[PDB]
Structures are given as C-alpha cells and as structure tokens.
C-alpha cells in the first residue's frame, strides 16, 4: 500500500461547515515528509507529539475531514476554544492527538463577489459534542411563543452563508482545512511506513 493523500488533497469540491465530512484510512503507510516540506500549505498547527517522529510512530486507524473555514477564526479549531464555529460546526476532543493543516486557495473559489455557496449554522440548542454532525436543517425553536413551526418571527432560520469577494478584506478568503486525527484502540497498529 501507499497511502492516498493525493486523492484527499487534489480533490476539487469541498463540503461546508454545517455538512462537514469524514473518511477513514487504514492499512497504509506514513510519508508525511512531502506534506511538511512541500511548503504549499501555510499552516501546520498541532499539539502533543512533534512532527519529526510521526514517520515511525503509528496507530491502528486514522481519520480525515475536508471542508473550508473562514480564515479570521482559525483559532476556533482547538481543544476547548470559545466561539460560534467552535460551537455549532466542528468540535475537538480535549486531550488532542491528531493534527490540523490549512492553507489559502483563493484562486479557484475566488468567484464573483457576494457568492454564498457555503453556509454555516448560527443557532442550535445548547452545546456540541465531538464526532457528530447536524443534518437537522429544520427551523430551530426560538419560539417561546410558538410562531408557526414554519419560518416567521419570534423564531429564526439559522442557516446563514459566507461571502467570497476577490477583493475582500482579510478574513473571508476560502481557506481549506484538513484534520488528521490519531486514535488508539485494542487492535495492533496498522498505519505507518518506515
């Protein structure tokens, strides 16, 4: 085996933060040197272990997610950080082992200004847990007085979208973000190279 990060990164279409994805990769090898040293990715932030020892250190099964996030709120991907996309879109376990990689790619999705193909949910009951999504596109209950069940006032439609102008200020370019989470089970380790 050779572990397909080319069929991860060189994909063309990415999801949105309300409908972020998963994919599990197993029985492959570790070749993170090209990811480190290609220098086409601006960000390589993570905690715990140091990248100089992940070409031998390995686990039993790894996971990956691929979707685009606002660049003015990149600190909101952390174990225990406040915010709103750190509230209703993607959570992380507190004792964190995996690693997050990001970069700026405002050339392919630098479309005509005001384009809002990618959305984000603003209002949801209470809190989040890691490792589950929200496909409930239903209109949420702000209605202490029950308005309709259909959208009205005293009640809101919480699914607002982004904006991608090729001359925006600094925080609205579409930075793609991936996370490669490490987790350990009873099974023997499988995913590493030399």
């Amino acid at each position: 085996n050779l572990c397909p990060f080319g069929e991860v990164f060189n994909a063309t279409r990415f999801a949105s933060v309300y409908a972020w994805n998963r994919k599990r990769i197993s029985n492959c090898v570790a070749d993170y040197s090209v990811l480190y040293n290609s220098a086409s990715f601006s960000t390589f932030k993570c905690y715990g272990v140091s990248p100089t020892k992940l070409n031998d250190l390995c686990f039993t099964n790894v996971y990956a997610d691929s979707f685009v996030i606002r660049g003015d709120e990149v600190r909101q991907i952390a174990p225990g950080q406040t915010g709103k996309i750190a509230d209703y879109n993607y959570k992380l376990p507190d004792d964190f082992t995996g690693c997050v990689i990001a970069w700026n790619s405002n050339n392919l999705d630098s479309k005509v200004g005001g384009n809002y193909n990618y959305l984000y949910r603003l209002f949801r009951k209470s809190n989040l847990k890691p490792f589950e999504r929200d496909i409930s596109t239903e209109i949420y209950q702000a209605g202490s007085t029950p308005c309709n069940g259909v959208e009205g006032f005293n009640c809101y439609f919480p699914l607002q979208s982004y904006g991608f102008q090729p001359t925006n200020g600094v925080g609205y370019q579409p930075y793609r973000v991936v996370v490669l989470s490490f987790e350990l089970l009873h099974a023997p380790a499988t995913v590493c190279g030399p």
Partner: nanobody
Amino acid sequence: EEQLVESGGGLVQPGGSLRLSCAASGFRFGSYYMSWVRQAPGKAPEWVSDINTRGETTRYSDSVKGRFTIARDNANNTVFLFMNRLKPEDTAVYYCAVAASGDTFEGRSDPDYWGQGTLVTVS
C-alpha cells in the same frame, strides 16, 4: 474589538523608503507576537518578518534579510517598519498579525487577526 487598521504606505520611487504603522487597541502589546506579512497578486501570502515579544530581536525572510527591519513600540500601540533600496518586485499589500504558539508546538502557526490592508507600489 481587536481592530487592526494599517497606514503609512502607497506609491514610492525605486530606492525609496516608507514607514507603515498599524494602530491596534483593546489588548496588551508586550506579550504578543505581531508579524508583518505580504500578499502579492496571485495570492500565496508570504511572511517577511516577525518581532519578538521582547525588545528588538527579529527574524527576517531571506529576500529582506540584511535589508529591511522592524521597530517595536509598546506604549504607542503600533508597529513600525523600515525599507532601504527598494525593488520593483516588492509590490504587495501589507498587514500586521497577532500572537503565535501559546506554549504549544511550531509548524508555521498561522495568526488569525490581521489588518485591513494597505497597498504599496514601487514605481
């Protein structure tokens, strides 16, 4: 809250010199990293320099190493910069940055709060 608006740039001649400044407010100056970054047409933002949290020790990019420097100002809530012997290829929009690491690991940590944007053209 943490506003970053920068000023002090614009048109300039070859061999010129410009003094930029971004005035931030609402938070302290001493303990936070605040770098300078460039963005050319064609995107791909490229770091140039980064002041320490301490006085004046600073690492520069190899295109500007030995040419361009930074200046620290804790009390004035702004960061200064200096150019000498400009090149026509140094045309990019300039921003300041915000803190890094947080007692965590390295790997080109990317700050979030950057500036409004100031265009600089050498001509």
